[PDB]
Design an enzyme around this catalytic site. Structure first.
Site, short mmCIF file in Angstrom:
data_model
loop_
_atom_site.label_atom_id
_atom_site.label_comp_id
_atom_site.label_asym_id
_atom_site.label_seq_id
_atom_site.Cartn_x
_atom_site.Cartn_y
_atom_site.Cartn_z
N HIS A 19 -75.16 20.63 -33.15
CA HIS A 19 -73.86 20.10 -32.80
C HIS A 19 -74.10 19.14 -31.64
O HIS A 19 -75.06 19.27 -30.89
CB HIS A 19 -72.91 21.22 -32.43
CG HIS A 19 -71.53 20.75 -32.10
ND1 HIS A 19 -70.79 19.96 -32.96
CD2 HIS A 19 -70.78 20.90 -30.98
CE1 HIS A 19 -69.63 19.67 -32.40
NE2 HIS A 19 -69.59 20.24 -31.20
N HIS A 31 -65.96 16.49 -27.67
CA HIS A 31 -66.64 16.66 -28.94
C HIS A 31 -65.63 16.88 -30.05
O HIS A 31 -64.46 17.10 -29.78
CB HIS A 31 -67.62 17.84 -28.87
CG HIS A 31 -66.99 19.19 -28.77
ND1 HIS A 31 -67.47 20.28 -29.46
CD2 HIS A 31 -65.91 19.64 -28.08
CE1 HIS A 31 -66.72 21.34 -29.21
NE2 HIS A 31 -65.77 20.98 -28.37
N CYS A 93 -70.95 14.35 -36.14
CA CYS A 93 -70.74 14.64 -34.72
C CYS A 93 -71.58 13.73 -33.84
O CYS A 93 -71.11 13.26 -32.80
CB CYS A 93 -70.97 16.12 -34.41
SG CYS A 93 -69.72 17.19 -35.16
#
Length: 105
Positions: A19, A31, A93
């Protein structure tokens, strides 16, 4: 592990998947995250990392200029609350935080 610098890309090593987040100072990252669709969230790095190992990884600084850090922070914070419809793959991401640090790809 010492405090990241505002604008730093954070690579988080969760079991079997990565991530990405971006440091915005004072313990916070921005995020993409699930509500429980995905939403841009501002959360504590302490909470986002949890027990998972992480590192600063500004991997493209070798060949590309980061934006002025004030602009990185401003853009990241302006997006908080926005929703996206794509899956939270490491790739997506990472793409998101890259755009914040370096500008549109």
């Amino acid at each position: 592990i010492p405090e990241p610098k505002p604008g730093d890309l954070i690579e988080i090593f969760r079991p079997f998947y990565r991530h990405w987040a971006i440091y915005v100072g004072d313990g916070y990252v921005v995020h993409l995250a699930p509500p429980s669709k995905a939403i841009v969230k501002k959360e504590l790095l302490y909470d986002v990392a949890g027990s998972d190992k992480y590192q600063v990884n500004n991997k493209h600084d070798d060949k590309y200029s980061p934006l002025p850090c004030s602009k990185i922070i401003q853009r990241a914070e302006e997006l908080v609350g926005q929703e996206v419809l794509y899956k939270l793959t490491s790739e997506n991401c990472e793409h998101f935080v890259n755009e914040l640090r370096y500008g549109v790809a």
